[PDB]
Design an enzyme around this catalytic site. Structure first.
Site, short mmCIF file in Angstrom:
data_model
loop_
_atom_site.label_atom_id
_atom_site.label_comp_id
_atom_site.label_asym_id
_atom_site.label_seq_id
_atom_site.Cartn_x
_atom_site.Cartn_y
_atom_site.Cartn_z
N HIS A 1 -0.12 3.65 -8.02
CA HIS A 1 -0.88 2.97 -6.71
C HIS A 1 -2.04 2.44 -6.91
CE1 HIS A 1 -1.43 6.71 -4.37
NE2 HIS A 1 -2.56 5.88 -4.12
N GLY B 1 -8.89 8.43 -0.68
CA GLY B 1 -9.58 8.84 -1.84
C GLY B 1 -9.08 9.95 -2.51
N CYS C 1 -6.10 10.83 -3.68
CA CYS C 1 -4.98 10.43 -4.62
C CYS C 1 -5.32 10.97 -5.99
CB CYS C 1 -4.25 9.44 -4.52
SG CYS C 1 -3.63 9.00 -2.79
C1 Q45 Z 1 1.37 6.88 6.09
S1 Q45 Z 1 2.32 5.47 5.48
O1 Q45 Z 1 2.11 4.43 6.59
O2 Q45 Z 1 3.68 6.04 5.22
N1 Q45 Z 1 1.56 4.86 4.35
C2 Q45 Z 1 1.03 5.31 3.22
C3 Q45 Z 1 0.07 4.68 2.50
C4 Q45 Z 1 0.20 4.33 0.86
C5 Q45 Z 1 1.70 4.11 0.55
C6 Q45 Z 1 1.56 4.16 -1.08
C7 Q45 Z 1 0.83 4.95 -1.95
C8 Q45 Z 1 -0.45 5.01 -1.27
N2 Q45 Z 1 -0.55 5.68 0.15
C9 Q45 Z 1 -1.94 5.78 0.66
C10 Q45 Z 1 -2.09 7.21 1.01
O3 Q45 Z 1 -1.05 7.72 1.44
N3 Q45 Z 1 -3.13 7.79 1.13
C11 Q45 Z 1 -3.63 8.84 1.45
C12 Q45 Z 1 -4.21 9.30 2.80
C13 Q45 Z 1 -4.35 10.36 3.26
C14 Q45 Z 1 -3.96 11.38 2.39
N4 Q45 Z 1 -3.01 11.13 1.11
C15 Q45 Z 1 -3.08 10.22 0.98
#
Ligand code: Q45
Ligand code: Q45
EC number: 3.4.19.12
Lengths: 304, 304
Positions: free
Chosen positions: B41, B143, B145
């Site tokens: 991603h 950040g 990830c």
């Molecule tokens: C929370 S959701 O509405 O299901 N969308 C997830 C967003 C995308 C979904 C596709 C992959 C990247 N994330 C970002 C992500 O989760 N970042 C993050 C932030 C805090 C803690 N861990 C990681």
């Protein structure tokens, strides 16, 4: 998202751990520049520990009696001295992995990471707090002495603790890196009982702010209190008194969440009086006090 | 004396963390040999995350579009490929700090350490468990990830997790180092709800053995039970079923303490039915399930 008991990355401190042997006792040493710091009780036998006279015992020790090994290689000891309860063994080689460092003496309530070692080799890392009775609740077995506690600010390691002993109750006692014990403890196998282990109020409040930031808000109530009213309840529950300095330190957390410090105090007061009722806060069924306000800010902001 | 939630020393993994940027997204990468592993991603913009077609998005990316920086120095990307949900960026330089390593896919209930990073720089280390619903309860912000989970056996790091996302409920999801998600999660900003987060029974039992070894014995009762009787109660409390394989794994703890596994099950059964009554076990007011039997043995024996 999420809040964890987090230790500092231990790499910089792993590069400083060495094994120190004197006679039949092997413990850990901290190698910074051309000096290896270790608990002075390395010179004692089990029969010496009952009532040791460190100055007298040290007279029978020469540089060649302190065996220092870093990895699988031996370091040459060219000097030794006792500073309070630590020995400083001068070696002929500066530690090539010496990070930028400071020796700090922490106050009760301050947290730090411990890199538990055996035979100069790291076994694990965990986060501790200097209790208000000057003990730490660590995880240390025979051979862990000389393991250190530290904090890191970007690239400077501030060493604050060196492990020396376990009290008969299973709690731990040690010194700063100048060899001065935290609290009234002595490096002797004798009757040493800890005082009251009160709860670090300012740390609980910081952790309640961390819970609000992370979505755990059920404990927020419609009340406020004053420092004096809160402190009457805090005394009753064996919590440390909250001062205006602690309120000032919580200011950034109050600002980020919009919850006045005294309002969070009133929520904490109700949690003390009513209990958790089988509920949890940040996956804990008790009020966590080993996160400082600085730790909450650091973890919630991602400081590296 | 003492029992702490302990993570592995993180030094070996700190030497592998790099920053990976693609377009306006910066996350972490794991540099082992001449390959940098990172969540795929990294190629997505916030507008792509809703319904990304990774193969299509990757067509618009060339080696020079992946910016990899280790410390303050840039690595040259000479190849890139997608394996499941991770990208493997081939660089022209083998990581000089590559430890001995393996990629393992863990089972639910297994614990591991996470080195939380931002911009390729380590911020902290904590211990996690792969939950029975294949989520982890970590501490990760935007950040983080590409931050990894691992176990260490003497000098071999077994990487088991790479952080990819947070679910709308604040729990975390990621992959093994072959890019396969744990559980049914997908790297897409969509409705992904976790299943039941049951308690890891074998881990609670291991932690009860750790409490007995460390002096916390108040919960030991005069009862025994059978696997079938215990499992009827475990089901009722959302605990994972206990198998004869789990009983076998607890054998060394049973032997060291002289407490038969089924007797410890009966103590656990009474703790579930009666509650803690305001008491604590190893400083916790809830039954801890993020220590495996192997972790208890390792910590109680001082494995380095
Ligand atoms: C929370 S959701 O509405 O299901 N969308 C997830 C967003 C995308 C979904 C596709 C992959 C990247 N994330 C970002 C992500 O989760 N970042 C993050 C932030 C805090 C803690 N861990 C990681
Ligand atoms: C426990 S006592 O009867 O007060 N005697 C303490 C023994 C001496 C007293 C003088 C200094 C050395 N200790 C050994 C010691 O405490 N080792 C140890 C073991 C486990 C965890 N942490 C450290």
């Amino acid at each position: 998202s999420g809040f964890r008991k987090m230790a500092f990355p231990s790499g910089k401190v792993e590069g400083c751990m060495v094994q120190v042997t004197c006679g039949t006792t092997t413990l850990n040493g901290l190698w910074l520049d051309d000096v290896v710091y270790c608990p002075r009780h390395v010179i004692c036998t089990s029969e010496d520990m009952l009532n040791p006279n460190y100055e007298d015992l040290l007279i029978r020790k020469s540089n060649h009696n302190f065996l220092v090994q870093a990895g699988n290689v031996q370091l040459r000891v060219i000097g030794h001295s006792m500073q309070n309860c630590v020995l400083k063994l001068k070696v002929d080689t500066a530690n090539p992995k010496t990070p930028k460092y400071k020796f700090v003496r922490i106050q009760p309530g301050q947290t730090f990471s411990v890199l538990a070692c055996y035979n100069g080799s790291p076994s694990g890392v965990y986060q501790c707090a200097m209790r208000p009775n000057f003990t730490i609740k660590g995880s240390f077995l025979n051979g862990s002495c000389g393991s250190v506690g530290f904090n890191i600010d970007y690239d400077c390691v501030s060493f604050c603790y060196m492990h020396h002993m376990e009290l008969p109750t299973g709690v731990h006692a040690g010194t700063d890196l100048e060899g001065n014990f935290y609290g009234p403890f002595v490096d002797r196998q004798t009757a040493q009982a800890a005082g009251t282990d009160t709860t670090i109020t300012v740390n609980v409040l910081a952790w309640l702010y961390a819970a609000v930031i992370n979505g755990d808000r059920w404990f927020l109530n419609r009340f406020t209190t004053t420092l004096n009213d809160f402190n009457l309840v805090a005394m009753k529950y064996n919590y440390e008194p909250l001062t205006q300095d602690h309120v000032d330190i919580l200011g950034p957390l109050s600002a980020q969440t919009g919850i006045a410090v005294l309002d969070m105090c009133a929520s904490l007061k109700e949690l003390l009086q009513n209990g958790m009722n089988g509920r949890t806060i940040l996956g804990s069924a008790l009020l966590e006090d080993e996160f400082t306000p600085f730790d909450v800010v650091r973890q919630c902001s991602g400081v590296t």
